[PDB]
Amino acid sequence: NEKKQSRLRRAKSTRLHIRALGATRLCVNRTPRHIYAQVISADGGKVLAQASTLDASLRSGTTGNIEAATKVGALIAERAKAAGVTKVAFDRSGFKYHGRIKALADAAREGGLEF
Amino acid sequence: STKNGRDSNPKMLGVKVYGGQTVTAGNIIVRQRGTEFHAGANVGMGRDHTLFATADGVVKFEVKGQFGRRYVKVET
Amino acid sequence: ARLKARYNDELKAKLQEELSIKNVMEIPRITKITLNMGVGAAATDKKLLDGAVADMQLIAGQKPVVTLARKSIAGFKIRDGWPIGCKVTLRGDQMYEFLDRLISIAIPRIRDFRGFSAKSFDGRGNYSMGLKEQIVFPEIDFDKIDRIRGMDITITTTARTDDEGRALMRAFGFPF
Amino acid sequence: MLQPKRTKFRKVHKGRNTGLAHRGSTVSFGSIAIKATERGRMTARQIEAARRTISRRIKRGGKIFIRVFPDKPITEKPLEVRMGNGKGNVEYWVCEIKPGKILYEIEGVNEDLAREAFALAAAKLPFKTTIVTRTVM
Amino acid sequence: MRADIHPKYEKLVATCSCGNVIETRSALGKETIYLDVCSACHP
Amino acid sequence: MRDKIRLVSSAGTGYFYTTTKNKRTMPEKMEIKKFDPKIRQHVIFKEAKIK
RNA sequence: CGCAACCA
RNA sequence: GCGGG
RNA sequence: GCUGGCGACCAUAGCAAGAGUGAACCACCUGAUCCCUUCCCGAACUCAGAAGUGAAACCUCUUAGCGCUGAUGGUAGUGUGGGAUUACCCAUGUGAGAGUAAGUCAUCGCCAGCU
RNA sequence: AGUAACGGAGGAGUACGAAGGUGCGCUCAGCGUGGUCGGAAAUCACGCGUAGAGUAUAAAGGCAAAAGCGCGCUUAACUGCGAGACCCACAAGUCGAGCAGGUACGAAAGUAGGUCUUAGUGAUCCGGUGGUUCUGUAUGGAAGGGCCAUCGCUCAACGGAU
Ligand SMILES: C[NH+](C)c1cc(NC(=O)CNC(C)(C)C)c(O)c2c1C[C@H]1C[C@H]3[C@H]([NH+](C)C)C(O)=C(C(N)=O)C(=O)[C@@]3(O)C(O)=C1C2=O
Ligand SMILES: C[NH+](C)c1cc(NC(=O)CNC(C)(C)C)c(O)c2c1C[C@H]1C[C@H]3[C@H]([NH+](C)C)C(O)=C(C(N)=O)C(=O)[C@@]3(O)C(O)=C1C2=O
Ligand SMILES: C[NH+](C)c1cc(NC(=O)CNC(C)(C)C)c(O)c2c1C[C@H]1C[C@H]3[C@H]([NH+](C)C)C(O)=C(C(N)=O)C(=O)[C@@]3(O)C(O)=C1C2=O
Ligand SMILES: [Mg+2]
Ligand SMILES: [Mg+2]
Ligand SMILES: [Mg+2]
Ligand SMILES: [Mg+2]
Ligand SMILES: [Mg+2]
Ligand SMILES: [Mg+2]
Ligand SMILES: [Mg+2]
Ligand SMILES: [Mg+2]
Ligand SMILES: [Mg+2]
Ligand SMILES: [Mg+2]
């Protein structure tokens, strides 16, 4: 509650700026057990692509560490290129950019996503 | 003799372009002290909180968000 | 050091039985202990200004922080943003160590020590003690001591009622 | 005579007294009331005089509810000054009276003694008044 | 914890005057010799 | 009050900026990096007396 | 503190 | 701008 | 049928009061060696995890008590023409605020996972 | 929109190299309950918390992506400009996306041409200082002038008569 409430307060600024820029957004979410990435439209309503640690290719392994995040980043980069999404803005969603989030973002940069 | 004779010059504030009117880029829409109107799409804000059109289109006023803000936007 | 594993191994079932707490998670635990030392005489000298911080860093293993002033109370002769306090927050592996080193090596070391004041719960399981001098501390020595001030201590626990707080403080062997 | 303990501003525009009194028009504190059917101003001196003549008459039995309070300051120029040089000085305070306004209410007194008291008070006021009773809707 | 900011706190054995030798991690830098204890008081 | 001062380019060009400064809360000579347009480059401008 | 110089 | 304090 | 994320919409959606959820998910959680943190503190942030618990929290249900919405009618005001001058009246057009009856314990979309 | 009176109320003739930029973080004021002096009102802890705090400064309009409060690094308090507007007797004033160069911060999308905004000001003439392949009274120089930058007015009766 208090944690999620404060983190969403931290995310609002970047989210409103991304909406004002009118850009495709790579929104990420991180829980102690899993990680998620969604490539979302500029209008904020349509999910153009997605990836997570629930994919029958990462779930059977272990999730919630930096290696699983790198794998998710590679997978979301591929799926986003498949749907014709190249230029994105990274939405860390109130999480610090360092760590698992950074691993996902680096895997996505190397996968072909431009940001 | 009293101590009241002062006032300042007029500032000519207010809505300059109303809803439905066509604008070009750079046209001033609102002269305001604070933000009684907030910039929506294709509308920028100047240092003195002036709302101006950053694109051609028609002006549209709305009430949006959970703070019930008045928004100006330009439809292209 | 001792108190942590003691509560982890002995006091847990004891508290659960004595208080009748069904869920394991909702059992009274100690969350933090904060030692504040208000010193209003700050703009007057430096002995009693950094002496509180040094006495804390001696007593508490962790360094202190300088609590500033939030407003400008005229009758108090303070202005917004001026150092008027000091504090330290012991959380874990040091909070239990402070509880030990104050409840079994310095608890009964003050002159004419009655039991305690056991009606200070703040409507919840959070207790607040008091002290008149640092002489009781087995760390600060009365030779090096100077400009005797006193410290306030507040133990914050994950307790709901004052009864649960009383139980959690008794299991730790309080002065009652 | 009544007066605000303090105000935000010393002097006030003249204004227009127009319309009917739809708010303070119902007997709400007592059993009988005097009600203004005409429009005007009520100085604080008039309020004091009418309260005195009512209270001396009903002889302290029952309570009197004053429902008007003078909160408008009225200025006047000193004698033998010309028309400029700022606004005149405050002299007295008035309450604006719209037709239908309850001025005084009496609780705990029979109807005839209270009507005598209200007739005595009416001769101290600058507008026409009426005697009204409490109803139920 | 920040390292080069805090004080030093090491082990410490406590010799009570009533046979209740204790052990604690404190900042006395020596061996404590207690007179009063949580067993040798009027609590 | 605040005194007027020049910030002269340390690039040889005669370019300068003008600003004000509080002589009591800032007695040392101000040094700040600014764009010289005669060499089209950021250099250091040092304080000098207004002329 | 005084004497003397004053033509945006 | 020249001396005094 | 359930969770998660991102939106639309900004109280007919809220407060207050009850009640339920652990396959999964989510939360609390265990520890901090390492990356990162603390004007002190692994509280927060961060990392490595999976022994527990749905206690708290979230979420989902139920309830008009309060909020919120809200007619109809009347009233106030008012444009034009006319009549009076203490601010009204008449003809015609317009028409609140308050209050009343009543309604509300949301509706909708994209994606993923679990049954 | 504008709108007068010797109508009713108040402010200004500044401040700031950070109180500017940027990235990151934070959220008050008031209540209750406890706690060493310490007490209605200092600092600590816990519960609420209706915007009632704060904003360099008067008031108004704003302020959660806070425009309020901190920390790190910094100089965009840049140069050349500028579509298009607002306001305007003129002279002035105001806002400005975008473009080029050189930057700062940021992983990055980006954000920065001073400060929440609206007061903090003074034309022209005469002259001073820096720069300048503009000019240079036969010619070459120079003096002097021009141009760009900037300095000197309670010219406050503030469009300033000497
Ligand atoms: C539509 N209303 C009922 C609403 C809904 C939500 N919820 C969400 O959107 C997210 N959670 C849901 C969708 C409800 C499950 C809301 O989260 C909110 C609000 C209301 C606003 C009102 C805010 C308001 N001001 C700041 C514009 C205000 O003055 C108050 C107040 N108590 O005075 C508020 O509480 C307000 O700030 C506020 O917190 C709101 C919400 O958070
Ligand atoms: C500061 N913001 C985050 C905020 C938070 C809360 N609520 C809380 O803090 C919640 N309280 C907890 C700590 C959860 C118990 C708030 O409750 C509010 C507000 C904002 C204010 C804004 C107000 C504003 N004006 C008057 C300054 C305003 O004009 C509006 C508006 N919609 O136009 C408001 O809503 C405002 O008046 C208002 O009500 C606020 C809040 O209530
Ligand atoms: C509907 N709005 C206008 C509202 C009104 C009030 N009422 C008052 O404060 C009344 N106070 C008076 C007496 C009028 C001065 C309200 O008291 C509230 C709220 C908003 C709610 C929203 C709550 C919300 N839900 C989903 C739990 C929520 O999640 C948030 C949030 N994410 O910020 C809230 O702020 C919320 O919990 C909350 O506090 C609300 C109100 O308190
Ligand atoms: Mg922020
Ligand atoms: Mg508002
Ligand atoms: Mg009607
Ligand atoms: Mg209505
Ligand atoms: Mg509100
Ligand atoms: Mg002249
Ligand atoms: Mg020549
Ligand atoms: Mg020249
Ligand atoms: Mg003149
Ligand atoms: Mg003039």
Amino acid at site C85:
G
Tallying the residues shown for chain F, one arrives at: 51
Closest chain D residue to the Cα of B1, Cα to Cα: D85
Name the nt closest to D23 by C-alpha to C1'.
Answer: I98
Q: Does the CB of B66 fall within 7 Å of any strand I atom?
A: yes
Give how far Cα A101 sits from Cα of A29, A88, D2, D33, Å: 9, 15, 72, 77
Strand partners, F31: F46
What distance in Å separates the CA atoms of residue D102 and residue D130, rounded to the nearest whole number?
10
Give the residue among F2, F30, F3, F35 at the shortest CA–CA distance from F16. F35
What distance in Å separates the CA atoms of residue B43 and residue B50, rounded to the nearest whole number?
10
E28·C139 Cβ contact <8 A = yes
What distance in Å separates the CA atoms of residue F24 and residue C70, rounded to the nearest whole number?
29
DSSP letter, residue B20: T
Look up residue A102 and give its two tokens.
């950074």
Give the residue among C156, C91, C152, C79 at the shortest CA–CA distance from C122. C156
Using a CB–CB cutoff of 8 Å, tell me whether E25 touches chain C.
yes
Locate the ligand 2 atom nearest the alpha carbon of residue B68 and give its number. Answer: 32
Name the nt closest to C91 by C-alpha to C1'.
Answer: I41
What distance in Å separates the CA atoms of residue C87 and residue C56, rounded to the nearest whole number?
8
Ligand 2 and B68: CB distance under 6 A: yes
CA B5, C1' J1: Å apart?
Answer: 23
CA B3, C1' J154: Å apart?
Answer: 21
Closest chain B residue to the Cα of D85, Cα to Cα: B1
What distance in Å separates the CA atoms of residue C164 and residue C127, rounded to the nearest whole number?
11
Experimental method: cryo-EM
Sequence spans of domains, chain E: 1-43
Longest dimension (CA), chain D: 55
Contact present, E6 and C62 (Cβ < 8 Å): yes
Give the residue among A47, A99, A96 at the shortest CA–CA distance from A70. A99
What distance in Å separates the CA atoms of residue B69 and residue C153, rounded to the nearest whole number?
47
Look up residue B19 and give its two tokens.
């809803």
Of residues E6, E34, E38, nearest to C61 (C-beta): E6
Contacts of E37 in chain C (CB under 8 A): 104-105, 108
Give the residue among A36, A59, A39, A60 at the shortest CA–CA distance from A48. A39
Ligand 1 and B2: CB distance under 6 A: no
Sequence-distant (6+) residues with CB within 8 A of B6 are none
Helix (H, G, I), strand (E, B) or coil at C7: helix
Ligand-binding annotation for E13, yes or no, is no
What distance in Å separates the CA atoms of residue D107 and residue B32, rounded to the nearest whole number?
55
Amino acid at site B67:
F
Of residues C57, C115, C175, nearest to E7 (C-beta): C57
Please state whether beta strands E10-15 and E32-33 pair in parallel, antiparallel, or not at all (unpaired). parallel
What distance in Å separates the CA atoms of residue D121 and residue D55, rounded to the nearest whole number?
10
Look up residue A105 and give its two tokens.
């973002």
Give the residue among A12, A49, A50 at the shortest CA–CA distance from A34. A50
Give the residue among D105, D83, D84 at the shortest CA–CA distance from D27. D105
Tallying the residues shown for chain C, one arrives at: 176
Amino acid at site A80:
A
Give how far Cα E42 sits from Cα of A37, C107, C174, D46, F22, Å: 64, 12, 13, 80, 68
Please state whether beta strands A25-30 and A89-91 pair in parallel, antiparallel, or not at all (unpaired). parallel
Give how far Cα C98 sits from Cα of B51, C11, C139, E4, E27, Å: 60, 18, 12, 21, 11
What distance in Å separates the CA atoms of residue C137 and residue C110, rounded to the nearest whole number?
9
What distance in Å separates the CA atoms of residue C152 and residue C34, rounded to the nearest whole number?
8
Residue D135 CB neighbour total at 10 angstroms: 7
Element at D92 (helix H, strand E): strand D89-97
Contact present, B61 and B44 (Cβ < 8 Å): no
Contacts 24+ apart (CB under 8 A), B43-47: B43/B72, B43/B73, B43/B74
What distance in Å separates the CA atoms of residue A84 and residue D75, rounded to the nearest whole number?
79
CA F39, C1' J106: Å apart?
Answer: 28
What distance in Å separates the CA atoms of residue A60 and residue A54, rounded to the nearest whole number?
9
Q: How buried is residue D81: exposed, middle or buried, by Cβ count under 10 Å (0-12/13-18/19+)?
A: exposed
What distance in Å separates the CA atoms of residue D137 and residue D26, rounded to the nearest whole number?
10
Contact present, B64 and B72 (Cβ < 8 Å): no
What distance in Å separates the CA atoms of residue B55 and residue B39, rounded to the nearest whole number?
13
D85·B4 Cβ contact <8 A = no
CA A21 vs. chain centroid, Å, equals 18
Give the residue among C48, C154, C143 at the shortest CA–CA distance from C98. C154
Mutual orientation of helices A66-82 and A100-111 as an angle, nearest 10°? 30
What distance in Å separates the CA atoms of residue A53 and residue A69, rounded to the nearest whole number?
8
Look up residue A45 and give its two tokens.
């309503």
Give how far Cα D110 sits from Cα of C56, D31, D114, D131, Å: 78, 9, 6, 13
